[PDB]
Amino acid sequence: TIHEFKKSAKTTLIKIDPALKIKTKKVNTADQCANRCTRNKGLPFTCKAFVFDKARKQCLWFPFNSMSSGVKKEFGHEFDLYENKDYIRNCIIGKGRSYKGTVSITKSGIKCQPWSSMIPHEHSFLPSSYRGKDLQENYCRNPRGEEGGPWCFTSNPEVRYEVCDIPQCSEV
């Protein structure tokens, strides 16, 4: 069940508004935290995210994710952040510059090439180069905010890049 969460390594979140509440608990594996989050059992809220402290083998279930207002994230090798896809807007607004969804396949059905690889296609579109644009894994993105919306370098050598078929949130 831990696979249906967007994972961001060495990350955790921090709150600000005292009202915003948490629930923690020692555990064995990060898997263990996912089941409880997904099932939303014994939790005084909606599990939209959780962190697993690999160091203190702990689960940190949150009623919010990295894009929640009033919460910032922090570095930690020992931490691993898992966000519930059901709470990460999966549709596009405008040119889709703020799309953080997990679609990784182009419109014609071809798997996206990670932004970390220069194979098959070489490129200067590196994560460090574009901060805030979430160029993680091989997720369809639109760092430059171009007309076509989110796209990705294809794993098919003949197709340098292509657009992804992510829907618009509201286009009547």
Next chain:
Amino acid sequence: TIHEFKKSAKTTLIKIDPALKIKTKKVNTADQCANRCTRNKGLPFTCKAFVFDKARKQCLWFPFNSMSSGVKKEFGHEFDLYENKDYIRNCIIGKGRSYKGTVSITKSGIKCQPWSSMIPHEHSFLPSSYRGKDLQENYCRNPRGEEGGPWCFTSNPEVRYEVCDIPQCSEV
């Protein structure tokens, strides 16, 4: 992997658009269609949904869902529809009247009471009547279009009903 699809028993989809392409194949089980869809390995498009023909134990992979334009659904006992949640708007527009996501947990974190149940709470919100409102399972909904957004009757005898924390597509 089939659990990451919204299921609509006895249902299938009929394209109207001739371009909009499909791909079919005999298979053994419906799970078999899911894996192929999720992976999107042998398809010339983005799998957003698929139908499993229990009769002809067949798979119909679609580059669209029940809310795609130019495609109508049809009834059929031998058919089951599965839509990729990654393509079913997961945020709310306005009062949330057209919400079709699968969130089934009120804001305080309690499981929803399916609409087909009169226990714990009895009600006048049944599928039968108010249709087109997808009162399936225990999905948070807003058939009437009320102020607070999609909600549900709580499986907690102490709480008649409560609202869910489904994000608005206009984040904040």
